[model samples]
Target chain A: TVHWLFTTCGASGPHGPTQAQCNNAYQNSNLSVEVGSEGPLKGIQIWKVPATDTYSISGYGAAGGKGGKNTMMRSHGVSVLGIFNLEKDDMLYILVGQQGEDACPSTNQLIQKVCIGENNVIEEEIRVNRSVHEWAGGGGGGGGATYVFKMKDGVPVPLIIAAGGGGRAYGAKTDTFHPERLENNSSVLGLNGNSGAAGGGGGWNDNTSLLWAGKSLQEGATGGHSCPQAMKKWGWETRGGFGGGGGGCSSGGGGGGYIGGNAASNNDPEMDGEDGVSFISPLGILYTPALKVMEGHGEVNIKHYLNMKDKFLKHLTGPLYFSPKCSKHFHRLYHNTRDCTIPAYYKRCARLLTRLAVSPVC
Target chain B: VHWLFTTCGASGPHGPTQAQCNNAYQNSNLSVEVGSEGPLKGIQIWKVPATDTYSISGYGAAGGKGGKNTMMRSHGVSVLGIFNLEKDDMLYILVGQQGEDACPSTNQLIQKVCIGENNVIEEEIRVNRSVHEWAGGGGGGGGATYVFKMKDGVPVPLIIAAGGGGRAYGAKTDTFHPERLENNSSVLGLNGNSGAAGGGGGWNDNTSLLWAGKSLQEGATGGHSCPQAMKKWGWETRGGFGGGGGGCSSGGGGGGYIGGNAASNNDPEMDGEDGVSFISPLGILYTPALKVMEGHGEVNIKHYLRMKDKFLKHLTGPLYFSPKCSKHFHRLYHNTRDCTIPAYYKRCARLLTRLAVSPVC
Candidate 1:
């Protein structure tokens, strides 16, 4: 069977209503999820291989919302795991999005987490926004993943990994006297989520941050809000997150998540949240005898039994088995079944027969 | 016959009565006379071999005259000729005194002459007087003549020549003007006459002319004369001929013919004449067949016979000669003296032999 893995979840929606509506109506519903004790953690699903499958993961997405206006909030983190049978050698391929961090409001319980996994872990922090004021923009995306034949040796082979980028501050107010214009916000499109674009400053300034990761990964959209004077009717509305569409001029709207739509506006008209989406194929168990599985919160870890799952997973086109037992099983069963048999098993059988035949002599 | 010949002469002095008298005396006397003219002129005296037969000619004496207070005159020229019968050669010798010519009343002449064989002929002129009124000094003496054998040719040779020195100019007289005293006079020497010393020029505004010849043989003496001066006594008198010694404070004498002498009282006086002397030797005929035998009115030529007379007169020793006719006479006598033995016959024989042996051949 083939297996795929991904890291780093997409951004969360702005509120519960918008998030639920996106879950029911969005084409790819895996981008949004309910908040739990892990503070808006992104989840990964696994599937057994029936045919060759392809999947993609992206890091460029909106961040979780802040609790209220002028408050900061933490973003979501993502990880992917795979369980494989050691009896089959499987081909597994993974593509990861660019890593990015969420811009959480201050009153929000959510914490910003950077996604990290094989082929998705960023090695260094990168700036995502140009401005110094307000919330930080989302981080950059991570690199994709690939798999090959596992070795018989017990050493852990490292995979391509990248870490997400950090968010940035918003633009300054028009009424405020700024000596220099605000810096243009942008993002580095690579395994690491580079910096996001920052907001504009000075009188009547309007600028948004647009962040993208490596090729084939997701990119973050920019978010902005009008001046406080334009929004006086709605009172002081919160600014939306980036990597998705920005909030409306009157009321702040959340940015769309990586795999889910953005949340609806709140009572005080806080900024919207982005949708969330699944970036790559889910993890799965292909052989019952050759593979042993373990599960954690939205993560799974797999081990080989008799190294038979490695040979079994090779029949599938997708999913890569990285264990050593998978390599040995494929090596043993690669040819026609009629030509090779276990001589030791035959020898054991003969010994058991000897034990039965000697009962009379005893 | 062979005969020996010799000749001698002396130089005469000027007459004592002439101007610028020095009372100098000269003894010059000579005689040369031959029996016949033969092939030469003058005397022919011979010294025969053996028999002590010697012929002597008269002793000729030419007296020298004394000079007067104003001038002196030259002595007369003398000539002697001698010949050798043995050698068939002639000798002529002439001698004379060089006397000063008449000078002006203001000047005096001092003339000296040399007489000897082998005398130098060239001389240079020089000035000796410095006083403006003093006359120029007299010129130098002339060279003498000589007779000797040529060292290379071994032939006796003769030279005949005479030279007169130029007289110095007389001094100019002072005019008694103080300004005239301030001007100094020039008394330059004149050129020598012939090869003699040159004469001197007059002093104080006088001019002189010096003569020089292109050839060395006929050089002339210099003439000097002082210009007339306006003096208190009257115009200063003209100088005498030849160079005169300067008179006392008077004008100088003229050179050449008129010379002047100076006295203590500034009375211009005549000076003595510069001496002119000539030389003529008898032996000159041995080389050149023809030559000038007389110069300045003096005899210079001599024949072989005349040369014999001179040789005998001057010889202090015995003479010898060999007669040419005697040999021929002896031959004739041995052949014919026995037949006739007549005195007239012997005479005729000698005469014929002599005629046959004469030098004409």
Candidate 2:
């Protein structure tokens, strides 16, 4: 299985320089990892990836709380990898993802953090799945939010993957019934923050709108309160943050902070949010044979193997096997493949082998 | 023919009257014998007295010569008789010449007697060819002008006869030419008179102003020469006894004394002469018929007849016979036949019978 790693950072403080975040996630891990400089420090890597394997990773840093006459902020990231085998246990790995830096802190001291773990089983079951933000100013929906389907051996299928939604801004409210809110099945779904309504619980599904409502948590960051107003005047009304419900002036509420979903009614604070990333991977494991990782900034990249044998036999399972003249053969093959005939020759060989083994020699 | 007897008188010692001149011609023997006046005179009495057959008559006594005014007197009496006829004939008289009485032995004495015997042929070849003057003063050109064609048994074909000119007063000059004229081959014209230029020569073929020129022999009536002062004012330019030109005192010319064919021009005599008589038997005898004739007092009835018959018969003969009565029959046949028919019926029944038999059936 090819493993993919991605990283995310926290929302910036008001009027502050950005900080770098974690670069990748673990392929088979369970612990949440913090990525920005203001949060817990962590990094992740995957190895020995295999052919026909697939994986996904996602994370979101805490959102910037709204302030007077200031805008809210959010961050999210996700990645996808596909593995394919042309030889016994030899594979190719193809990877794609996005990365970002942490946001500056503002006058408000509210801090936020978010992370995701490797999901190999579910990624193998589905060719494409992801989370997305539909509204303003909230934590991104959970990174494992995806839809999956079984794949045939060598058939090309259309694939679509999405990044998780960013975290909601402090002092922002989340919608309760937005149609685009994340849910979990075989793929994980992110949850939204609490509603401003009294005794409102955390994110829950409600058919009337696709967003979670916020609760009377600690008085959300002052900057977060005015973010929506500023965004509204700028014609970004759909992406404006919600005003947090007050518990005290400067303390956290026992309820979780708002998470981002789709824009709902104006009364819902999660009506404004940042957009998520999307990608597609058609060949299961043809391009990615090992763990392919990405990190830092907003850049995106893909990784894959040069040969089927290298991917399947060497990189995917364990270590590569060699003959007495293996180095010379490898050098000769690598040098000879520069003529652009390698893929065709490889395909021809595979077909001949399959035909001879399966059919009578007629 | 039915004939009527009437008489014409001679010109008296003074002048002639229209009534008396008319009667003399009316009573002429040839006029009566030819039955020209058939309507008035009964059928001819062959054995009647000579006086009865031909009579002498008189018209108004000649008017006294105008007194010291020196103006000529009015004409003596004159008369006319019209006879309707049914046929054309030879030897028919168109006019009977008028006679002039012997002049009185006074200051104006001049012999004005007729110098020839009655009925004497002064000039004759055929009935239409003869020209004779009998008794008129100055011997009026012969009356009894007539016309004849070969088919009419006439001695001369295409002939004319005329009366003599009248006599002038002793002081006035006599007319020079006297003769009856003809209208081409188709007619018998009128006679000339002594009072005006003799009637134009018969059959005027050439362009001659015979009536308009001065006399060849006589000066134009002497122009009142006896009284020198009168001569300066009054100048008679024509010859005639009655109404002699004009008097010395008035200085204006007198009119012709008589009416009908004898009248003069109506202008002042010093300026022009009087007009003469004109007679046409056939209205269209010739393409252009006779235009003028002259006499002293009145028309000569016998002469008038002779000219009329000749003209009418000539016209009818060519028109009635040619195209065999198709052309001009409506105008010539009925009218001319009626004119000559009565004469032949009364005077010569045998002739009439012959005419009827020979006519186109």
Candidate 3:
């Protein structure tokens, strides 16, 4: 049975269908499918491979760090495309990243009571004090990463990963966030976030969560907050100071990807947001100038060709040639001779021959 | 009658200077480093002085970063062919550059900040970071070496030996294999691996859009791992790691007739496929598949004198003669199995045969 199947399915020259075949297939059936993100942090999308057809799937990662300061913005994500031998009903999971958030004003408030951890030691809070610079701006957040996972034995294995760009810093005296490279040397770890002057958060990791400022799992880094102490001091000094913020430092967030990039620290040389790395499994082809800086939010696209093999084989092996009897004496057959009579199998032969004569290589 | 083409930036304090190359044109005894400077800046040219049979071979650049435990990187493949030429024929040679190193230097200083574990706030401290642990930034890919002949004021590619892609860090059990092609009239280089989508292979010009490496112009540029926007913000230069200073973390693709794709995330660091290598008229190939090339890519040319009496005597029957073209006096004799010739080379072969100098043409 296996040998018979191999002989029947074997093909050479062009492995897939041509433009005309695909056009016919589309006219007869719905073969192509498309999916995109609803919004940032919406949810993952699931897809099952269809049966009896070949597919050529291509994916594009979302762009992060859409907003920036000083006319500086993060780069776009990478795009991957290929043809995979997927079985019928095979499952796939897709998640598009969110673009980084722009800067926001910082705020802080005083509490009436306080308690120590693990001891329940209560104490009376001090009188409240207000500052003038409570609305200082913070850095932008990093873009979220996009992913496509193939379920095997109930585990979602990554098939293609388009990394997000790092977030850019704002308002601070300097920026120290750096973007990730297109191809990373390390297996799973992200780059270190810069330190000093409201440092940005780290890039996303393969697992979940981000370093430095902090973030949700598989999500872009949250925007940095302005310095709270600096706001309080502004009441008297009338100028924005470099005091640590009550919420978080006024730094940029990390980009999303296989490994989370580290967020920068205070007063360190980490000047720009660090980008996350892109990834592909052994099943696809990588385009040159692989990594690119994109604009806007994350996205994904897919295309499948229906009955490609069957059509190609039929076109190659169909009976479109003239019968020996008819070719030897063409006028005798039409004039009424038993040997020249058109056979049952040869009814469509004439029509097919005419079409073949004008048919393209497809 | 002999000339050696080598890259200037490999394993030597100095390169092969003009004086040395000029001396080697007539004499055979020569040993010198490849030069990366004036007329020697990774590109070399040679002018044919007389009619003679020349034996040529090229070795491609090897893949970088194959540690003791990690997967072994593939070497660049080697190509050998024979050709006959006339006086004043110009041969342009380009030597492949080896892949750049993946590891960073140990002299730089970076401040260390320890973030709190699981949301605990801690005081920041500055300390001198030591370079002791092993880390990888995917190495820069190797450059391909090619040989072209000037015809009708344009360089026509004669032979191209592809370089291997940069290597990525992988497990011990992983393996890489080189490709080779043997005994064929026409051929194409193989594609490099991309986790799912590999980079396209090299092929003859105006054929298709899938070819990644091309010789249509002078040379093709390598993929950019980092974006230029990062450089504007003081990121500056990321020499060798990838393009710019974005800090490439993935293995780079190999350079060739069609360059190989870089090794992407979560996949073995497979080497790029070798580029296109073809001989005019007919030639024999030794390798089975176009695969690996080890070390820097170099062009080796050796000349033999008086081939009409010494080598032609050993050639068997089935001599070739062009019966269709009347431009020939029917004195030219060529022995081969196949009579078909590429259309692009038909005019060149006619010109060469008119002079009765090229044996293969």
Candidate 4:
């Protein structure tokens, strides 16, 4: 029943926020619901998806994300949602882990946790857990589900009433299509299964192209789309709201500032990670008109090479010669972003790394 | 020597036969070489230099012996002693991805075929996994779980089955992935995206007459899904009964009435054609009636999350499953009261073996 807000409704990438969206998530982050933080007796509550539209992703988070796995850096997006059934003065602390970005090496990870309070007496026992993964290198899972355990005669009897599907580095694998979508579709979860191999297409492209898409849910039947675009010459054509693609790599998209997807592999530029879409961000809890977004560090794919006017060239096709008639990459023609001008970028990057390996002037 | 990035090697008699150094080696004059006959595609040119001695060694799998202790083995093409090397050796280290193979698709190859311009690379050399196949190809089938969730203290069977076809984005095109998920979900308790649903049973099996006195029923409802559909015990037939029986490959008809005798004619009002039938060497198969369910088989799972948490009610927002590791979170916080964890109850046995062909203890 969990609705992956951002991705549902046939929505895809070019997701993640700009500094402005980051500012928004950062601004609303100070908001939180008090489930009786100063009460006398005990109680219970469930942090389920609100049946109404009045929740913002940032409205739920307190802090923002920064940095990534490699030297690449950016802000992380975060959202909050919880539940409780308490007495007059009972207090409860909640925290959700940030989606993993950095390689879980020795320490310092780019992704942090999303929680309520520090540590408490009973809190340690039923502490909410974090997310992780294996196949995608250090690309861990997004912040995980939150849990609450009430004391039964002074004993913390465990209860699992809240959970969610993981956002993926690869859609479906991480997308866990909502059961409802599955139900309605070919009897649920099963695709049309008849198309042999050369499968269908989809969402957000990565670096080099900032084809930003508005975060409005697309007009589709299933109401949820987990598409990743693989435009031959262009980059990932992400469309979902929160927007950003990671730095340049043979393979890999970006992790977050907020609700950002994972870096893809060089193997299948055609494939893409699932958008970090959670059900909690759509409700306008703090925002007035149900501000739907992934708060914290919004998506931002800074093209270092494309900007090197004197260097960067174009796609295997062409940014200049190929565009004899203003065909300058229909995308580049409009959005003011660095395009596929890179052979030079590659030459420079390699040479830079071989010697300079530093900033600006390199 | 030349270097190609992006992707690697392939198989086509008319194409370059990539040099495959297996338990063997080759010396060639032609301009191209095929990688192999088996699945072998996709590669990334991490590094490439001019001189033959300029570190061409550490780039890929060693000794064409294929992969030893990993998912990808060594199916590389090797060639020795080239008279002399040139600078502008247009070595198109052709790189292709591991697209699905025939009906039994695989993510097999990750090849590298070296082709040069002058004194150019030899013609395509073909290598393959002829000696090897998908490690987990034998087992396959529909995956479904019949869980009995508690309602008013009494739990009922919540049959969640027949979810498949996550192999690709478009149609439910069949895939020959090693995960076996693209095809069947017979193997129990694995990842979530396993097996597809099957059509119902047909032939004498469809007759209402008892096969050995066993009630021969009709079609089934639709395939599997989440928020599993619930079915009351002693399923009523003809009472808006699901008509086909789900099976392997193609979907089966809904659950129909248990006829009293053998069916000689294909009665429209009475019975319908059963979906296609499928079977694998290791018993894996596809059918409309059959489907799959994946995740945590014999292993103990963390806990049952709140099934209903909406409406200013149950667990709202994102729920965090406690991981046994370090984590972080934003403080845009809140607080609340605690709820008692439900007591453990006896559930289905061999939860992974809910398929029709197996024992249902």
Candidate 5:
């Protein structure tokens, strides 16, 4: 339903704008139809939620765990799920992004988020704890950041809509990172956030695997163990299974495939599992290399931009541009140099007013 | 009156006065804008009301540092207004959050805006620990998690922690100059204010630490905000009803020139009429919530955010901080209910409603 579910997810690593994969996916019409008609061998569902519920208690999405001394047996990111109700004026904050795989920790921005400062500061405090937090998320796949806004009661309530899963790597840049949330940690939270799957085995979508018609996909497509029986609840219909790299062999350069907290082999193949090393922090915690090293590096055209040609409420909208420095700091940090900082500073980060949350004033 | 005013005010360097404010208000157009849900997000302009005089509401919570019904409230909220009257004619506001007795903190909101001219540029704002007001004071000003845009090539000091006060401490022309030049005593601390522990030892420490760590000071006492690093400063700043002072004891520290502390300190100089000199069908209308000063205006937590959200149609403010994702604002108001917050904080917020002129506090 919320197409962004699939549009925003990144397989692994932080590259974005999988427009390449969008073409590759449709190009392989044979593969797509097979996935559609025969029913996807693997399927997973990524959903977008409101801010109030998740931020208040660290509730939803790919938000990883703190890797505290408690409950953390292995060094893996943990995510949670659920639903709660807030009031008409209930305010919510949201942070989005996915955990990292041991294979390429630096591949993506730790996570992404656009919320109120109250929660933003809290999330930053939590993020600065132990791991790198990238506001950019590579949930199911990496495409463009897609979202929508509406006019309500003269107030614009923003709902930072993220993506779902099975998306491909970005076509624009190979070694790119998402530009939002990603901070230091044992846990990493994303938009539809689960937790820091980067734990021992970087987790994501909270172990929700891609469910196929009859059984689970034999290879890397994993979201959860089961699929929802009723599609109506999701407000969407699966046209078919998303296609990219179902399974891969160790392959070439750029980031390998991405999935299940693991990226597939690029030098050797695509979607292929690989073995990695895992150790523990001096804190006595251990990290066993992930059992399955999944990777995602196809390419799709994810629509990620904000623009309005006309004015709202008759007020002329000002011209807007993203800061290159922020992109450099967040996306191109290492790719370029210090000289780029000055330019990025000028970019205007404008927000669109979407939802007007109103609580029943008693 | 001046004694009570000076006793509590953090005393910072800055702009705004009742008389000066009054002259500026009537000369320009007067308008009122309510807040939308959460923090203010999005931008739109509303035609100035037909009348020159009017009263707009919703700044911080009901009471402030002075208190109302025996309780206090969150200090995270403030207000800002930008007018092109000059290249840097931006009016800002801040009232330190409730005292140390309150924990964590509420989401910070940049509310209110008192500016001259027929038109105004209104925007919402957000912040983080030791937030926007780094060098400004130990009061934990805005950080505000803000990034400003220059006019052509001109730069400006948009905002600093919890909103600044009227007259800051003397900028050291005396000795080495307290913390880099200006007297930024309002920096440092936790809970927005109160139990504020200066990170450095000297005057510069106040300025440096505001820009330094965002953790707790050592030997934790009655002071502090956010979860500070627990290093001890010789003294801790405070955020109770009045304001604390320098030096360390148990409940040690001084209340510099941040929010409500100024409400009382700056009030005696002028009547409530300082906000606007313009006349309505009735006469000069003063809206405490809409005044533009270094510190914050009055915020009635009970009737504020929700009320603004309800009146989104009537207000003109900018889009607020995080709404959809990470680094989102976690705390809005510590407690929604009136008495639910610390009694001391509630009292401060309540009295703030009375403005400084009223000795009710």
Candidate 6:
């Protein structure tokens, strides 16, 4: 049996499962082992399905933009669980989602010049103060998606996917109540955002584009862009902003998924970002309040079961038994005298073990 | 003369005339015709002129919010077409009204409480179970826009733009029994997270949660979205010819030639379904599922004058040889001399007279 856990929560260092840990899990069929103990993987992680009979898998997506002033404005991620039958030697690729950044602020400096005496005049120094802050700050960026897939002829075919949530715009006017949250066992389309807001990602259907929206998994969501004219005010040099660069704060980035989510416009963040795409299979169990589960980064958990024949053999071995192998003949036992497989000493040793009935025929 | 009318309630009975229409036409200031009290109750009417082949365009209204937690609602569909009409033909227009929400602003505590468990192994974190008891007040479905003509005193629908379905609400049953999750899934439209089907481009069939509507027929009444608790609370959950109303348990379906269905029993979070758009055979150049309108439905019509055949009465005859020659004569009469008979035509007539008097090749 093969058991593994993948998460982006680890801080740093050698966090992944060691060889000894994997061996212990392989020896103990019921044991479940976790991988990546420290931080997230540097890139995509690959897992080859062992010679197991059945398996159960669960995935959790990364959270959307964090709230700037009020925590309630924050959006939630999606969670999915399912049981499936996979073939041996099948290759499974896993990509964990990345969490969205918190909302950031924007600032500007106003320099004043005063006339002095004589030939030269001195200019006033640029100073900073809380009263001098401009704009409510840009909306948070959306979270990335987490999914598992099997490559078919070089193309990655998704078996199951959990979509990320849209980032929360900074100064959203209306109250958001888990909007765009999905539940149950069916596939649906992405939603359009409110006025001056971005649209949600697509699922079974194509990404939404009534106005602005997202597309397929290969492409990531683009951040909101701000105009230069919109930033310049009465002689103030602005700096420090998030999202698509510039002085005036920009809207949030779209969530990533099978279809990526849309980014909100630079117009005031009166509305929140759109939700991302989500999907599940027939054998899958869709949880209630599915979107509001995971808070930060995405994660995947898997549990494998041994075949019936292998389970029976392991039960009889009592943890000390090694795999039965024959040097002369692959399938035959070592003490088979009729085949004349081994020497006399080997046959004597096999006869001595026959009292314990390691093999029924013996 | 062509005329436009609008209303929110019945109070007065006057609409814009041809001169006033042009002044307000630039920016649709006619929208001000709507008020709390109007001659018409959420209805707009258009009096078709003596012209034929006029274009008519309409936009359906959007559905209302389910509750405070539910933010997204389906947008209404749009319909555009051109139709022929007789003088004084009345096009009765019904602009859809936004569906009512189940719960608006209040101090109600609607959240899930997580219960901590005693089981805490070294590898296993604390086991927690969350419980939430939601009052489950689904949002109402949006109303459809209907353009119809009275035939033999019976209203026959010519164009119907369906409204969106309402969002689903949650109940107390799923609060403690968290293991039994909802069996439904999300559907497409402008939003997601609902079991309700989008209003059909044509009429949609009935689902486990909704009823079906009719097409190319009289206005179909939408389904009622009253749950037991809602009825006990004495709330009006009746639907109009356009759409069904939302209640404590489920959202209503949109109204159309064939009406949309309502939401299933409210338990899971959901978004409303979109309405369908339709146009009769009399209409041409149809564009459905347009997401342009917002709060209420709108209608606009432009009358085009038909060409008169009297201008070419004297030009048509067997002597014309072919129709193309006749077209040339007609063009000559209108474009060249601006007279009943041109100088070239007069000379040709005099030559024919001389030929009758003597032999001239």
Model 3 spans > 4 angstroms off: A1-362, B10-42, B66-69, B104-136, B171-218, B221-248, B263-293, B304-361
lDDT of 2 by residue, B84-159 (tens): 2223332222222222211221111111011121122222213534222121121111121222222343223222
Ten contiguous residues with the weakest lDDT in model 5 chain B:
B1-10
Off by over 4 Å in 1: A1-81, A84-260, A263-275, A279-362, B1-361
Q: Lowest-lDDT window of 10 residues in candidate 6 chain A?
A: A107-116
TM-score of chain B, candidate 1? 0.24
The local distance difference test score of model 5 is 0.20
Per-residue CA lDDT of model 6 for B1-361, tens digit only, reads 3333322321111223333323334333332222123323334445554657776666566665543342555555556566888887877676665665554311111110001111122112123221122223455666677677778965555676666655544321211100011111131111112232223222222322332222222222333444443333322233323543343345555555444544443433443455545566656643323443445555656664312234333443223234434443343334321123332243233222222222111
Predicted structure 3, TM vs. truth = 0.32
Superposed on all Cα atoms, the candidates' RMSDs to the truth, in angstroms, are 75.1, 74.7, 30.1, 30.6, 26.9, 26.9
lDDT of 3 by residue, B319-347 (tens): 34444332332322231101122221232
As for DockQ, the candidate ahead, 5 or 6, is 5
Give lDDT tens digits, candidate 5, residues A156-247: 22222222122222111122222122122223332121112111111212233333110112222222211122121211111111211111
Q: In DockQ, how does model 2 score against the reference complex?
A: 0.00
Cα lDDT tens digits for candidate 6, A1-362 = 23465554231111123434333323323322333222222334567776655666666666665433333355556655556678887777665565555542211111111001111111111133222134333455555566676677975566667767666654454755433433234344433222233333323223333322332333222222222332344221111111111112324445655545554444444556555555565554432213334565667767763222233333433322343332222122222321113231232223223312332222
Cα lDDT computed for each candidate against the true fold: 0.22, 0.23, 0.38, 0.19, 0.20, 0.42
Return the top candidate by TM-score: 3
Q: What is the lDDT, from 0 to 100, of the residue B71 in candidate 5? A: 19
lDDT of 4 by residue, B4-83 (tens): 12111222101123332110111111222333442112111122123232211001100000111111111111111112
Better of 1 and 6 by TM-score: 6
DockQ of each: 0.00, 0.00, 0.00, 0.01, 0.01, 0.00
Worst 10 residues of 2 chain A by lDDT: A245-254
Q: What TM-score does the predicted chain A of each candidate obtain versus native chain A?
A: 0.23, 0.25, 0.48, 0.23, 0.20, 0.52
